[PDB]
Amino acid sequence: TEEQIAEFKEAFSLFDKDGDGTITTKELGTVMRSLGQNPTEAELQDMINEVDADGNGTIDFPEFLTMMARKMKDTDSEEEIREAFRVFDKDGNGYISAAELRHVMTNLGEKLTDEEVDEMIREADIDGDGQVNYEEFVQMMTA
Amino acid sequence: TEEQIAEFKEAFSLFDKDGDGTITTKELGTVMRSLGQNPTEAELQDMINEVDADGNGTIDFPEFLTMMARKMKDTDSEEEIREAFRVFDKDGNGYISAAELRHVMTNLGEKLTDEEVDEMIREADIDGDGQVNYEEFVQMMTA
Amino acid sequence: TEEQIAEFKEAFSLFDKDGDGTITTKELGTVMRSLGQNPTEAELQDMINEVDADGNGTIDFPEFLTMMARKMKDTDSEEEIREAFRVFDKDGNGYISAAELRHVMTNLGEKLTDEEVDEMIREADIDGDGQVNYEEFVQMMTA
Amino acid sequence: TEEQIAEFKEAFSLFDKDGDGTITTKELGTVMRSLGQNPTEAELQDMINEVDADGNGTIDFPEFLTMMARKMKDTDSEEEIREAFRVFDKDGNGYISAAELRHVMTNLGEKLTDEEVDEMIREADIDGDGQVNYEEFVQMMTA
Amino acid sequence: RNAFYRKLQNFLYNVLERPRGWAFIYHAYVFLLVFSCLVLSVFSTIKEYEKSSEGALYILEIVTIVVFGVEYFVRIWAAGCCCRYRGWRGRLKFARKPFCVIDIMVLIASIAVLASALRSLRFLQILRMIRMDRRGGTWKLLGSVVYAHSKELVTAWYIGFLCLILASFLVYLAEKGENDHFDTYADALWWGLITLTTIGYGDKYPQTWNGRLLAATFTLIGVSFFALPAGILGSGFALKVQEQHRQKHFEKRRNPAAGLIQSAWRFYATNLSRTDLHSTWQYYERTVGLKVSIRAVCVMRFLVSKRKFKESLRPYDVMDVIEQYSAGHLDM
Amino acid sequence: RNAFYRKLQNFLYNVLERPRGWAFIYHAYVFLLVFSCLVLSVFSTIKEYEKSSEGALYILEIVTIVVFGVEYFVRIWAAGCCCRYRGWRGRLKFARKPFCVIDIMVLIASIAVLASALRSLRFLQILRMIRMDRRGGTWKLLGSVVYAHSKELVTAWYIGFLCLILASFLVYLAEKGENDHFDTYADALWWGLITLTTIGYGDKYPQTWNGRLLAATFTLIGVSFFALPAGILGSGFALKVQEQHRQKHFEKRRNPAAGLIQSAWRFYATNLSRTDLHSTWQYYERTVGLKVSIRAVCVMRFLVSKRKFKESLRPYDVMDVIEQYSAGHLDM
Amino acid sequence: RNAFYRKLQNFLYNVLERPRGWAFIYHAYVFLLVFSCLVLSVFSTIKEYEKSSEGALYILEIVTIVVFGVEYFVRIWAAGCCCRYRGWRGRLKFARKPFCVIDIMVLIASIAVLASALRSLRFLQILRMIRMDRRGGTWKLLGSVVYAHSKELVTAWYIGFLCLILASFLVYLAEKGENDHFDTYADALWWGLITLTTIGYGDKYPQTWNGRLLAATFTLIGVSFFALPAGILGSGFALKVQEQHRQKHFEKRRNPAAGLIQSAWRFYATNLSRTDLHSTWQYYERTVGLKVSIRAVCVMRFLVSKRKFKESLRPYDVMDVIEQYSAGHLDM
Amino acid sequence: RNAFYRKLQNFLYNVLERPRGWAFIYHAYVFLLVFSCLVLSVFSTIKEYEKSSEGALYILEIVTIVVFGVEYFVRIWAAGCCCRYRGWRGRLKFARKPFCVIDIMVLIASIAVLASALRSLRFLQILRMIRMDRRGGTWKLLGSVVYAHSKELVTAWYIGFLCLILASFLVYLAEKGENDHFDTYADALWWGLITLTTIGYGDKYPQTWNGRLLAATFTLIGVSFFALPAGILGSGFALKVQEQHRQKHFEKRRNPAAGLIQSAWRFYATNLSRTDLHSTWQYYERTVGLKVSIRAVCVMRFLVSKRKFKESLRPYDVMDVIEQYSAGHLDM
């Protein structure tokens, strides 16, 4: 819809700082700092690698629009989530304890709050029995 | 017997310092310091791991009582002692020299005094010939 | 021809500084510094190893004359260039992109200017289509 | 003969400093320093290990007398010299160049003077052609 | 009672679809069933044993049809474990999988046969034995091992074929005149194949001194080079097992996966797929238009984490330590 | 004279129970004895050689009974080496071990037989040959290797069985009419099994051009895939030997065991199992109610040391260096 | 239109000369063609099938001649891909390569035969099957593996030959009198060779008790030691594959090659082979008689880079890490 | 002219005694010679070929005697290369070596025979073929590999023997009544041995349905477990080759050997074995009773260097890097 396109254009303009028609490394760094997390040069390089595809050293608007258009169904990442959980699935049966996820997820990677891992469990564990199934989570939303 | 239970309760109270009904990491550290050896955070973590089983971060009284009740016969550690001696049994025949034990045991791990390794030999080597047998030691007391 | 021999003698004399009839390590270092690049002791050792063959610790004139006489056809280095390109030939088909060579050659080893890698491509890529062939380059000049 | 025994006793007394009937670690260190080379604690430990056999921490006189009695024929070290030369025998044919021995022996281990490696070659290379044979050297003296 | 429903469906799907441990027990039994039928089928081709064997085979085939139909229906139901095959549409899609199609085809063919037909019975037996794979794992593993050792296998095949041809020709020359075994070069080639393979039927063998001498000199090479492909393949299989074991011991990909799941949840919450997802937004605002910027940065974080996890998703034995030490040394 | 008593008992228990080196010599001799009897038993089933073979076999079986009875009694006595089997109660418990029960059963059966019985004699021979293990080590090792290479073995079995079935069927079609060897599909399957196994009796072999061509094309694959399981198992055995050798070279568990024994003695002395143990208490007091606290801390030290030793009790080749370098790098 | 010309020539040279991937498909087809002819040739030696087989074989041989001639001409043309075989002189030099000479010889011989000749036809078939290598890769690989395991192979051969001799002699002694199979020691040796190789024709086998006992005791050792060379070679092939795979994963020679090419271009530009090459001279002058000194230093830089690249051109598995850690530790 | 004398003696000793490269060529030729005689000897046991074979064999045996005598004398002379076998005493001691004694015994026996004797001729042929080793290298290598894989070999032997016994007994029960092949259990055991070894003579094979079914089920296991020992030994040989190759690449013992030779010369010069050795004494005095102290310290330096070199004289693959990194980490 046109409203979504206008919102994406506004977001790109907000990311844009010097008005060169593109989002540069410094703009990514300053938005990262504003979000609260201090960025790194390698982090911004990965930023550009994910976004940039033409190899220009910056980020353009059509690429951002196309990527935002790509929702979960175009990510083909079901196998990636399955592998991640299998790595988490120590026993391999297909059951993950809620407590282990709460303790590790809040102490590994981009750690979140306790309520956010409660939301983890609620979204993944449909029955809310505290036993998360990997396949159900990977297919329920992404697929 | 009731006397042993009372003694264990007194020991737990002595370990208890702030009177929270449990033995915490700081109490373990201070008792370690009182004993003479300076403790470490990892050492107290292993403390809790050995004692704690419910995963509460502290030590409770019933667990201590049950563990003290467990004597050598419930340790199922005969194979562990056998493996330790086999590691000590360089030749593998089943004979260990008294002098080697005296020199190493007092210079490895929680080193003790010379008389304590003399007691090592006396307890293990029943015949007192200076030749310690691993199986006789592992089965004589623990089994 | 006699003119080339005289020019080589003049070059050797220019390399010669103390007039001992040979080019020593210090002369190699000072000529390296004059060229612009700061030399290293290991670099001068490799210098001598390449030039010296009799094992005297210095460089003599007949060896320099003979080496200068050896043109590409006596280098038997076709296989070396083939292996280098195959290492560069990621796909192994026999095609190398101009952009990758421009970006790497100017950022690896004795890096040169952009026009010098343009000359790379022009000399190697005869058709000038931007797709360099390894075998054509190794055989066109060295062979 | 009695003269050799008296000379060995005089040597032991010279090594002896505090007159305890044995050569201690400190005496070995001070004699090493007098010889010109600065000793090390590990070096003196190896000293004692080579000399001492009863495990007393020092060196006694009968052991020194017996060791001095042991001449090359009791060393059973022919295979050790053969292996050392084979390690030196890069080609494995059984020929070692004089120049390589002169350059390495004076720049490896307990390096000696140029005349001492000339003596190396003279003793090993009987014909004095500059080509040392390993087997001839190992068997000529030690065997 | 949907918790027990889901648990039972999970167990059934695990047993029927890719099994890991004791589930194979069930499959073994099923295989035995099929195997039994096959054996009885063979006993039905012998006139003497036709009566009893066919009498038992009819009952066993009815039992096999019942078991396979029940298994097919239970598999179709248990496919609901995966949300991909959810609902009637998902179940039908699962039933559309080519191997499930072959399963239902075999079931219907057996039902029709049991309702001259022994030929189709044998065909169904072999086909349902092929069905045992359902994934091509055996074929894929064999192909990977053969490709890995393709050059060595080609060497063995080439030299062994040359040895066969040469031995056959020379023994033919030696034995053509005074041995009815080697009447034509085809007989010589048959003898060479049956000798170098070490089968040695004994229908043909050299009987002259020339023939026996040549056979002795060439058989030693030929038998070895004919046994070489089996040895190469067996050693390759064992070495593949070893490397797979080491790699499994070196999965070492917990942290990238944890970051992946973290950023995946962040992307799910930031996106407007649901409206109730607002606590993560409050967490982002407390940790500091703005919402779209947060969404974009979060999805890009998800993408970078995905790529980082994928790059580390190939843990190997020696390259791992080599690269780790290179990183440590350049750090130094 | 109990020192020599204990030394002799130790030596006898080592020789009879798990042997390591030259003790096996004795076992070999015993095996030879049994083996000899078995061979003579076979010679007793031939009418021509019955007389002499049975004459020698009677004496050899009496000798075997005497040797096995002496060995059983000596084993029962030497079990006193281990304090677990101490006293009459401990010795009886040792005699209650299932394999010792089988030993005494074999002894009593042989005594009864020697006091038509040749059938039971053969049974006892095979049973006492099975007795050679006494631990299942052979079976456990075979099972471990088979499980490790289960997938490769299944691949080989599947493809080889398909090859057997296909080759047998095609050669049957080729040879059914004009070869009495292939009269029924059972004959074809028998030929295929005896060919792909490379046994090649020669009772059946293709004689047509179709049959020989099909046999040539399919035998090459079939023989290789039938020899594959043996090659896989042999390579797995050799690789297991290699890894075991490396792990043995990397026991590297002296210090955890030393700490374990230290804290074990500390726990023994602190506990009130004995009253004379007081020197360790004096050492604790000089290195500083209190006694119970010391006991508790000491037993907890023993537990932590036990767990630390157990964790390090699995030294491997590549994971060891990987983890050690990871620790070094995170230290850096 | 020379761009498409060069692309087509490159593709054809890759397919005909050293192929890597799907190019082999073509070769396979060609091989099949040749193979078919060979098979038909065999069918032409049988009187019953002579008519049809020869009728098809004439056409197939004409097709093979056409295909091989086209391939030879296309290979001669595609050799222009490499500048070494450029122009008429270069193409003639390529045609002078010994294997191309053999190719044209085979083509001319087949043309002459197709224009008693069946013998030369068979010779050409075998020769053009040998032609399949064109490089000796199979022979070189076999020789390398045999040399690597030369000592183990010699052990196996020695012990197996001793076992053959001893078993043959003892079974001869056992069977000389009462078995017409073993009439002379030559018969015993033939039986031993055909037994220990496991071929087992069945023309000779022991029939006495002495002979069968001796055969049983010695065959177990002999068959194992005769199968040993094949197992050794197969395991060596597999291990070579493993080490080659690891080394390929560890090429790790990008930077030395980059420096090599850099200094190679520098040497090319500095040298007076061309007059237009002056921009590099300007770069050298801007980065600071002089020209000859620059040429000399540049060529010496090329030489040092060449030697450095060559030294690193042998990347191995364990020596690489050992040397890297030694360098790191001496740095520390 | 003693330089050329010593060079020739060195070359001859290298060729005759332990050879490394092309020297083996000579040995091969010699072996061929002996081999030829052996073959001719076999042809002399056949009445038809006795005349020509013996006519050639006489000349070939005279040639072999001449060659072996020349080789023995040249070996005795070339032993002077080693100073241990120097002079007449040293040469006689070399001739006293047991294998040289066997060599001269074989020479004298052949001379006597050539001066019914065909039996001793065959004995000499086999003995001089055994002579090919002269060191036991083949036997030592086989023993080392067998010992390394002793447990796996015992597993294979045990399970295969059980399979043989069980299959033989069951097929005997199945075939005793209606198959003259299995008349006694000895016949069944012979069939089982000839089947599981895969030799398959065909003199005995099951012909009932029970027998063929039991044979089919048990042969699959038996053939694999009978081929297992060969596969285990071959894989062990290949893995030993691999580890030896790596260890050879990791000799890495230059510096300890250099220190060893340095201190060895120092000990030689310090000791009073010679009087002219005084320059090293001057070097010691310039680098500072005293002479005896210098001698003692020097010999002790030699001893410490010897022990250090010996300790490092066992360079291995993984323990080397493990210990090196442990030293580096404890340094850190």
Ligand SMILES: C#CCN(Cc1ccc(F)cc1)c1cc(C)c(NC(=O)OC)c(C)c1
């Ligand atoms: C060695 C030899 C013979 N050859 C090669 C060959 C065969 C026919 C040709 F016409 C030409 C070359 C051969 C041998 C075996 C054991 C097999 N089976 C196999 O590899 O199973 C995995 C095959 C597929 C080919």
Ligand SMILES: C#CCN(Cc1ccc(F)cc1)c1cc(C)c(NC(=O)OC)c(C)c1
């Ligand atoms: C390949 C092939 C055939 N098969 C597989 C097979 C057999 C019967 C079926 F009915 C179905 C599949 C096979 C082959 C061998 C050598 C063995 N023996 C063995 O592995 O010893 C370790 C076995 C146990 C099975």
Ligand SMILES: C#CCN(Cc1ccc(F)cc1)c1cc(C)c(NC(=O)OC)c(C)c1
């Ligand atoms: C073991 C045994 C017999 N021998 C050794 C031998 C043979 C003849 C002699 F006269 C003397 C020694 C043997 C055995 C095999 C399988 C082969 N084939 C082979 O290795 O293929 C790679 C060869 C080349 C020799």
Ligand SMILES: C#CCN(Cc1ccc(F)cc1)c1cc(C)c(NC(=O)OC)c(C)c1
């Ligand atoms: C049957 C069988 C295998 N053999 C004997 C054997 C070996 C090789 C041959 F070639 C022939 C016979 C065997 C079996 C076992 C279980 C053991 N272990 C044992 O008894 O120790 C307690 C031993 C020591 C030998």
Ligand SMILES: C#CCN(Cc1ccc(F)cc1)c1cc(C)c(NC(=O)OC)c(C)c1
């Ligand atoms: C499996 C099986 C049979 N056995 C074991 C066995 C034999 C006789 C017994 F009486 C008892 C146990 C067996 C098999 C082979 C191939 C060999 N040969 C060999 O290993 O060469 C290296 C031997 C030495 C024994």
